[PDB]
Design an enzyme around this catalytic site. Structure first.
Site, PDB file in Angstrom:
ATOM      1  CG  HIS A 100      -1.807  -1.147   1.372  1.00 43.04           C
ATOM      2  ND1 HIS A 100      -2.963  -1.281   0.630  1.00 43.04           N
ATOM      3  CD2 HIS A 100      -1.745  -2.236   2.173  1.00 43.04           C
ATOM      4  CE1 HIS A 100      -3.565  -2.410   0.960  1.00 43.04           C
ATOM      5  NE2 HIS A 100      -2.847  -3.008   1.894  1.00 43.04           N
ATOM      6  CG  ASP A 120      -2.113  10.849  -4.731  1.00 46.11           C
ATOM      7  OD1 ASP A 120      -2.354  10.612  -5.936  1.00 46.11           O
ATOM      8  OD2 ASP A 120      -2.049  12.017  -4.297  1.00 46.11           O
ATOM      9  CG  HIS A 161      -5.980  14.373  -4.538  1.00 46.38           C
ATOM     10  ND1 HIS A 161      -7.209  14.314  -5.156  1.00 46.38           N
ATOM     11  CD2 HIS A 161      -5.308  13.264  -4.932  1.00 46.38           C
ATOM     12  CE1 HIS A 161      -7.284  13.211  -5.883  1.00 46.38           C
ATOM     13  NE2 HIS A 161      -6.140  12.560  -5.771  1.00 46.38           N
ATOM     14  CG  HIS A 175      -6.435   8.066  -3.816  1.00 47.16           C
ATOM     15  ND1 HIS A 175      -5.635   7.325  -4.660  1.00 47.16           N
ATOM     16  CD2 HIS A 175      -6.566   9.285  -4.394  1.00 47.16           C
ATOM     17  CE1 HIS A 175      -5.303   8.062  -5.705  1.00 47.16           C
ATOM     18  NE2 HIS A 175      -5.851   9.257  -5.567  1.00 47.16           N
ATOM     19  CB  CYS A 176      -4.144   3.247  -1.194  1.00 43.50           C
ATOM     20  SG  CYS A 176      -2.885   1.993  -1.479  1.00 43.50           S
ATOM     21  CG  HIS A 227      -4.954  -0.840  -3.397  1.00 48.84           C
ATOM     22  ND1 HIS A 227      -4.266  -1.125  -2.238  1.00 48.84           N
ATOM     23  CD2 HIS A 227      -4.580  -1.779  -4.299  1.00 48.84           C
ATOM     24  CE1 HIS A 227      -3.502  -2.187  -2.433  1.00 48.84           C
ATOM     25  NE2 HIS A 227      -3.672  -2.601  -3.677  1.00 48.84           N
ATOM     26  CG  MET A 284      -6.391   2.215   1.263  1.00 46.31           C
ATOM     27  SD  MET A 284      -5.217   0.859   1.242  1.00 46.31           S
ATOM     28  CE  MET A 284      -3.934   1.608   2.231  1.00 46.31           C
ATOM     29  CG  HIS A 320     -30.618  17.758  -2.145  1.00 43.46           C
ATOM     30  ND1 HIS A 320     -30.979  18.832  -2.927  1.00 43.46           N
ATOM     31  CD2 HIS A 320     -31.632  17.575  -1.266  1.00 43.46           C
ATOM     32  CE1 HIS A 320     -32.156  19.288  -2.531  1.00 43.46           C
ATOM     33  NE2 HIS A 320     -32.576  18.540  -1.529  1.00 43.46           N
ATOM     34  CD  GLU A 343     -32.017  22.931  -6.967  1.00 40.16           C
ATOM     35  OE1 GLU A 343     -33.064  22.299  -6.718  1.00 40.16           O
ATOM     36  OE2 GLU A 343     -31.891  23.662  -7.977  1.00 40.16           O
ATOM     37  CB  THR A 344     -28.391  19.449  -5.886  1.00 41.89           C
ATOM     38  OG1 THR A 344     -29.676  19.107  -5.349  1.00 41.89           O
ATOM     39  CG2 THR A 344     -27.592  18.175  -6.169  1.00 41.89           C
ATOM     40  CG  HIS A 404     -31.015  14.977  -5.477  1.00 45.54           C
ATOM     41  ND1 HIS A 404     -31.873  14.649  -6.506  1.00 45.54           N
ATOM     42  CD2 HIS A 404     -31.788  15.508  -4.500  1.00 45.54           C
ATOM     43  CE1 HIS A 404     -33.109  14.969  -6.167  1.00 45.54           C
ATOM     44  NE2 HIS A 404     -33.085  15.493  -4.954  1.00 45.54           N
TER      45      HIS A 404
HETATM   46 CU   LIG Z   1      -5.862  10.853  -6.831  1.00 42.30          CU
HETATM   47 CU   LIG Z   2     -34.834  16.255  -4.122  1.00 41.52          CU
HETATM   48 CU   LIG Z   3      -3.814   0.141  -0.654  1.00 37.36          CU
END
Ligand SMILES: [Cu+2]
Ligand SMILES: [Cu+2]
Ligand SMILES: [Cu+]
Ligand SMILES: [Cu+2]
Ligand SMILES: [Cu+]
Ligand SMILES: [Cu+]
Lengths: 336, 337, 336
Positions: free
Chosen positions: C92, C95, C97, C132-133, C142, C147, C252, C276-277, C303
């Site tokens: 494993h 990363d 971001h 994330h891995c 993964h 993960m 939402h 709203e969303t 949603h």
């Molecule tokens: Cu990424």
């Molecule tokens: Cu709705």
């Molecule tokens: Cu992993």
């Protein structure tokens, strides 16, 4: 506002019209806050959605897919009388994304066939907003059966650009986009049913593939073409309200642009400008403002072109006026 | 502008280059408005899209997937000579999303094999914009056969951030992303066809699943890797133009960011900043500006990681320069517990 | 800063908390830049994700899906000790971001079972960010095995609106959304496997359909509903951090709104308002700020309502306080 204060406000009864048309309204609010009254009868009905005679058991606010656009101004109250006739088979309700509390109103509007209800909410936020039915345990089934629409809550002083300059439209259209899921027979022919409940299990199987069989405007392939093509003229300013209650879309005016686009649909969020293709997430409405500069036929599409031209998500505009050769000209027409 | 005024404008003939490279242009306009002239020949051609040898009957502006990036400035005119050679079998046209009228030019550029046309339009709005073929009744089939590209309409004063500060790139790349829908036999192996028409019905079936078999940059899995990896240096300012004519994408520079991202692709819409992953809807182009700060290999991906690493949507950058331990350091290298 | 200046910064160990809860932090930075130290042990374990006993071989940072939210301030350093116990069977890594260089840290943190590593990076940009891995050649496997998580890099002066006014939350929740791709046999029954690797080929086949079998919050259908609903009170300000490392989502709050939404997750990008969303693309985190105005049960959903109510992407909030009849009232309750 107190109960007494609300009771003293003026009342206005509005007559709704079928999409893509929008009921009579003023862009700038006429006077102070009012209680704006709407009535909708729910109709469970068969609709034909393509030229192969494919049927959907629609669950339709005001008898249409999408339901009609309701227009109020910020800090007005929207008072809806919702009616579920005895001729229907299912319980229905309404969730206004514009509203605050009780699951958008859904928790207070659960009506069996033969029942009616009256809901009032304060329209505190300006923008275009989805509304849809949402019976607990049966939510997406009603929504993807066409039981959704939108409202527009205008700012009291009308629309403005990102710099506070007024934007005033000549015409407004409401495009409701619908993902349908039609059951496968083994030969690949679409199944028909003689009751909405009979289709439930089969429809759920298709829904779970997350792959609609049809993606349409105004309830059917080609609905907003020909006799129902939207119209404009060169120089005319047009607002296109677009909703999708369940699934993402990416509107594009072929031959045009979105000069100002409230992609999130909310008027206090400054609009994007000069847009080729905008994005409206499932569960939302958006709005695009455009001034037509060229005459002729335009196509208005969901710009996944498979969705537009294989699955049905294409509308037309017919535009009158003088051609502008400065903007575009054929220097050499197609020739050997 | 009147016909006489447009006729009086300077003409400039531009030679196009193959993606991910961009023809010479410047950024700040040199002189007043001009009529910028481009020529593209359409080629219906077999291309190989993966290491297995999977074939697509591509429909390719200028012989490439994506078509090349055309660069003009706001209020220039773009004048395209489009040629459909007699060796082709289908009618083709062009829709410029940057243009106004006649379905983006599609209504005025329908050319049969053996025909050509010249379209001129005023580039009124600044930004990156998709262009694609769109023959009535056959639109998505042409687009998902690779018949799309993009243009860039720069502001006359070049790029600026949301607050009026100049943004000047050192280099520019154009990444065209393509969803392909390749039919499979009963063994699950990709089918090959003698003629483009033979593949139509089978391809439409796959298209209707809304699930591409391949999602690729520059026309093939791994096209922008190895000796074709994009390059930069620490301190270098890079503009990455990204288009997708049919389907959503979510670009991400693995190990980097988008310092300024015009996610809608339109330069009058202020850019988002400090982006991890941006979003470009199907039918649009976007642009990201980044200053590299660390050397080494980067992957540039559609960050649906299944699309990136199973379906083909991954490119590489090779970056020269000095490692920055302030920004990142391995305090303890992988070692036994 | 100089070499001595970096070395002279205070180091602070922080105890992590399982999602949807968040570890102790201050919104406004306390003191100058710090090296904030976290430790996570990777757990490979079978988890049950639905009401039918469906299993996933989870690959879990700190033993949870999603991994926990780590909170620092801009220009702090995050220093993670990542441990891969010898009882695990896969390599494993991680990363971030939020980080710059070496594939977000992935290139420097490849640990086999029985290994650990310590990565430090400067948190130069404010926002919520996915981690994330990402083992080369097995990245999505993964990630879609759970993960992944998120971090929050707060501005040193805390959050603000587009006009520079302070936004101070009373509480914060982290909702990690997970797309799962569980193989089925020819009878449609979900398959079980002895070891994670045994499921690889079958799982990739499902992955390539781009259609998850399950879309869940906090690692399982209904994980954030019922007695595990999130809570608030009328008048309380809540920040909801939402991440999706692999696939788009559209959050939402049913009955509410996103008053301020950093939809891109980055605090230097002005927040959208009155949402709203909202939309968070795969590979990103977003954050929404809301002041509750009505008591009762809320649903918080992706949603796409099929994803929410068929595939599992639905959470609840239980909210205490006084009902506001100005905002919403039932004028006429459901009746004949
Ligand atoms: Cu990424
Ligand atoms: Cu709705
Ligand atoms: Cu992993
Ligand atoms: Cu187009
Ligand atoms: Cu209903
Ligand atoms: Cu074509």
């Amino acid at each position: 506002a107190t109960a007494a204060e609300i009771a003293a406000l003026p009342r206005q009864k509005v007559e709704l019209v079928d999409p893509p048309f929008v009921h009579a309204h003023s862009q700038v609010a006429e006077g102070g806050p009012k209680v704006v009254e709407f009535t909708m009868v729910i109709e469970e009905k068969k609709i034909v959605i393509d030229d192969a005679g494919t049927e959907v058991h629609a669950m339709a606010f005001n008898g249409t897919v999408p339901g009609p656009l309701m227009v109020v101004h910020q800090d007005d109250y929207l008072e809806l009388t919702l009616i579920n006739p005895e001729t229907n088979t299912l319980m229905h309700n309404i969730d206004f994304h514009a509203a605050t509390g009780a699951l958008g109103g859904g928790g207070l509007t659960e009506i069996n066939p033969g029942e009616k209800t009256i809901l009032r909410f304060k329209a505190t936020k300006p923008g275009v907003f989805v509304y849809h039915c949402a019976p607990p345990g049966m939510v997406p089934w009603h929504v993807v059966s066409g039981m959704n629409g939108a409202i527009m809550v205008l700012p009291r002083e009308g629309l403005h650009d990102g710099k506070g300059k007024a934007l005033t439209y000549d015409k407004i259209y409401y495009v409701g986009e619908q993902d349908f899921y039609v059951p496968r027979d083994e030969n690949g022919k679409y199944k028909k049913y003689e009751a909405p409940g009979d289709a439930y299990e089969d429809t759920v199987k298709v829904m779970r593939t997350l792959t609609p069989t049809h993606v349409v405007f105004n309830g059917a392939v080609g609905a907003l073409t020909g006799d129902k093509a939207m119209t404009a003229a060169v120089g005319e300013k047009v607002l296109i309200v677009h909703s999708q209650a369940n699934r993402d879309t990416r509107p594009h005016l072929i031959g045009g642009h979105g000069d100002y686009v409230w992609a999130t649909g909310k008027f206090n969020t400054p609009p994007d400008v000069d847009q080729e293709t905008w994005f409206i997430p499932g569960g939302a409405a958006g709005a695009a403002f455009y001034t037509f500069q060229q005459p002729g036929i335009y196509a208005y599409v969901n710009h996944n072109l498979i969705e537009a031209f294989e699955l049905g998500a294409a509308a037309h505009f017919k535009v009158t006026g003088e051609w502008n050769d400065d903007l575009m000209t054929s220097v050499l027409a197609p020739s050997g």
